[PDB]
Paper text:
We isolated and characterized two Shigella podophages that have notably different features when compared with classical podophages and instead are most closely related to phage N4. We describe the isolation and characterization of phages [name] and B2, including whole-genome sequencing and analysis, cryo–electron microscopy (cryo-EM) structure determination, mass spectrometry, host range studies, and enzymatic assays of the tail proteins. Our work shows that these phages have divergent decoration proteins and unique tail structures, and encode and package their own phage-dependent RNA polymerase, and the tails, which display esterase activity, are dependent on specific O-antigen modifications of lipopolysaccharide (LPS) for entry. [name] and B2 are similar to bacteriophage N4—these are all T = 9 podophages, which encapsidate their own polymerases—a hallmark of this phage family.
We also analyzed the data by imposing icosahedral symmetry to visualize the capsids at high resolution (3.6 and 3.4 Å for [name] and B2, respectively). Both capsids have a T = 9 geometry. The major capsid protein of each has the HK97-like fold that is present in most, if not all, dsDNA tailed phages. Using DALI, both the major capsid proteins of [name] and B2 are most similar to Ralstonia phage GP4 (37), another T = 9 podophage with an RMSD (root mean square deviation) of 3.0 and 3.2 Å, respectively. The decoration proteins of both [name] and B2 bind the capsid proteins at the same quasi-sixfold symmetry axes in both phages but have notably different folds. By contrast, B2’s decoration protein (gp45) is only 99 amino acids. It also forms a homotrimer but is quite unlike Hoc or gp28. To our knowledge, there are no reported phage structures that have structural homology to B2’s gp45. However, B2’s gp45 had poor alignment with these helical decoration proteins and did not share a recognizable topology.
Author numbering:
A (entry chain E): 50 to 146
B (entry chain G): 18 to 387
C (entry chain E): 196 to 292
D (entry chain M), E (entry chain O): 5 to 48
Write the structure that this text describes.
Amino acid sequence: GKQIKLYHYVPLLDDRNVNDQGIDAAGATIANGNLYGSSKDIGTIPSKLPALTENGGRVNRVGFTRIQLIGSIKKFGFFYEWTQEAMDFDTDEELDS
Amino acid sequence: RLDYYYKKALVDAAKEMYFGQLAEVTNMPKNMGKQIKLYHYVPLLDDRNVNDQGIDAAGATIANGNLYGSSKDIGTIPSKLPALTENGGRVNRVGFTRIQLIGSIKKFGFFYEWTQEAMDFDTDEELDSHLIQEAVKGANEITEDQLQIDLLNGAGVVRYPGAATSNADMTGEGTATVVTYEGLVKMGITLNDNLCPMQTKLIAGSLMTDTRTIQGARALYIGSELELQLRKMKDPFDNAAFIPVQQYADAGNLLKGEIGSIASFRVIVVPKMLKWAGAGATVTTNPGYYATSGKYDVFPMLCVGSGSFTTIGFQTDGKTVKFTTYTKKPGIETVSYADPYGEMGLTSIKWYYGSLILRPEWIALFKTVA
Amino acid sequence: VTYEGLVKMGITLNDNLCPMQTKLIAGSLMTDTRTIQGARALYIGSELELQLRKMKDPFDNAAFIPVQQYADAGNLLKGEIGSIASFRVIVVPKMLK
Amino acid sequence: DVDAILADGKQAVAVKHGGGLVVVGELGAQVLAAKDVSELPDGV
Amino acid sequence: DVDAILADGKQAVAVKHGGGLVVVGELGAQVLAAKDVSELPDGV
């Protein structure tokens, strides 16, 4: 249908990876599913590291997202027209070429 | 139907590793505890040497067993020289000290889940491959920051541009505290006392037309943003200071991801370089500096030696870390009282990371630019 | 266009693009040649050729490198006039404005 | 952290059908284990 | 249906012995997580 749709998979640790499947190390449900974010700031990222313990369990859950890409195709054209009297009576005899 | 579904997907590439390759591992036994200790020894003359044994050569205790210490002052050394009379009764009574180094090992891990419906009735039939590729790649990514965060935190050599002394001091409001050519050479001079050896030999010079000769240097890891400032950096003679990499590519060997060299440093750009974002001063009238997140953003300049990163691997067989995965595919494998149908899956990645930072003479100089 | 302005493209674009199409040209045994770094073909209208020619580097030297100064050293792209920073300048007769 | 939960004394169970962990407190357990209006702790 | 529970922003805990499924609420869990009279909501 004149439309091409694509699927681009973002990295896990990108801020575009917004997903609800997020659990922190305390077992609660957090908002930011892409843990530790894309923020390259060491003032926050030590806190949001996936710190597990000896106990283990349902902690540090992560999700994954994907993005669509859509193209399009259009029509283009043109023409010209000539009369018989133009070619035969023209000075040049190779006008058609 | 309204559109054509192209199968091949656009997948982001994995950020190339830059820090994990420079670390050396120290095996930690299983049956015993979760800490490793070291006894670093200091020179007698070094000012770090403090000890009760300090009786003066001609007298009593003076609570200084390091003679003149590290004064290096000609007005002091002669007075504290161990002068001895003919009668050898008592003397300096030197002492010696050892330093205890402690290293900890922590635990980190992942997990994610998927239902059978998601895998079955999905537009793309390669969902499983994309998830595991994205999952393991991120584990590789996360491990890198674990190393880099510690290395940045632990560095004895921390020079501050201008008259600044702390992260809060840095600002771009007035005279922006930026890297100067004078500052970079002093960091090398401070590094020239010891520890960090000369990563690379000096370049003699190859037969060409434009090639220049550079001195022995040590790799300095830098974020991409600060590269421009290093480029347009005037030397004392108003000429260039950033020797481009191409001008010595023919002569010497090349380190991965190299941009150039300054004095005793070869510039290495790392795409994923953590920064002290929004840790400077309040940006009242920020003169177009990219360093702006609430406050000014401080960027680092790291120069790791060859004896300042001992990554401890618990059971890792000669590696900084191992990832331990566990896949429970939906079906009979996940049938229990919770779900007696098995419409759930699970994958978890666990790993163990720890560092030591022995001989902390790594160089970490800050900069607020762009 | 400014020299740092041009390289400000390079650093940002280095953080994502496709690699340096061309490699890093090394030194030749010639008597007038220069050395240029790995670049990505930059397309420019002929009207701006003079601007790049009389272009000043931050150290008040020539910024544009005439292509003949690395003709023997490496390989020349079609329509190449020269190289600036991490960009090999390609002129196009039909470039828009 | 989960150890802080255990060290405090509160137990924890696993939420299977969606969610992470809910943490059981002492009063809550007594509250949870109540049949009628005369079997829950005094406070509630 | 179980999907209606999650749509309500609600998590649910399975029961091993004789319950099958117990629905767990955020007010309830916050109530359920409590040492003493101090940690219960203003509503209680």
